Design a protein around this nucleic acid. Sequence first.
RNA 1: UGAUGGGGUUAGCGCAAGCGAAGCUCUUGAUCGAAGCCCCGGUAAACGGCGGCCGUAACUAUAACGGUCCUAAGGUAGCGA
Length: 45
Amino acid sequence: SRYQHTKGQIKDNAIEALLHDPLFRQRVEKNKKGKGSYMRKGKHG
RNA sequence: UGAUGGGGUUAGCGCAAGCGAAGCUCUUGAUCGAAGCCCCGGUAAACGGCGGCCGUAACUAUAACGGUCCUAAGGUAGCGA
């Protein structure tokens, strides 16, 4: 199925417009433990 | 205003050229001499003037931004085929 992208009416490049689109934003994950790992309640209980 | 210097003329000293004092003259004109101009600042509802180039962002585009040259200063608000 289709994808409703950000950049309305992409002209030239058909692949370097989507690279800035939030489909290809940088997925950064969370640490544990690690500079930024506070729980407050974890996955269970 | 006329210093100072130069020239003409001639009483005279030299039988020669030549020099030549006073006086009268022709000329040069140092000195003294103000505003103005140059110079110093001001004033634009005084006359007037009020920029180029070159890049630069999340496809493209455009450039908020940056570089550099020049000017007395680079046109601001408002409007604008």
